[PDB]
Amino acid sequence: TRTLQWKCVESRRDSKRLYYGRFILSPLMKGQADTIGIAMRRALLGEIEGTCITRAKFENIPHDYSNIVGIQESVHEILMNLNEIVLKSNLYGTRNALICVQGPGYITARDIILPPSVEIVDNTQHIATLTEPINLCIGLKIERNRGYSSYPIDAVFMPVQNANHSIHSYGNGNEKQEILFIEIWTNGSLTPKEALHEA
């Protein structure tokens, strides 16, 4: 129906936290594809917001470089595991979440008690290993922001891992029309199609 169309030509799920999408936009007048491509790339890599854990509070810990009896990992290793947890949310504001568990077992992302505005992306993400029936309570803070940043957690909010675009000649020089392709990689907090619309 429309003269200028766009469509997802490939959408792939590499893993729970690696989404791929390729999109086409054609036909475009000469020069328009270059304008769209660079602006879209800069918006995808620099203007899309995400949400993740910003800090964690430990109950009976002297410093973040000590060890806890009953936990295979160290306190510093816990913070790194928390930093890699992928969250999704549309709202702003500093939220708080909770980890309140009793061992032994495997602490994963699905064990986080999340406020109703926040959701987990990958359940299987590993937080800690408990080798003893101990009590572990960890407070969490969560924010939605742009770019990147109790023990603070170095949050990298950007959900778009990478982006790419290509420009191809449509054909004979009727108006020197061009074809635009856009490739988007996300971390699963939003789909590549949603990232394209948000940008």
Partner: peptide
């Protein structure tokens, strides 16, 4: 500004079903 906006409106287009 208007020409830039017109370039990115198409990504928000939907199709009749």
């Amino acid at each position: 500004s208007r020409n830039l906006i017109n370039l990115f409106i198409p990504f928000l287009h939907v199709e009749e079903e």
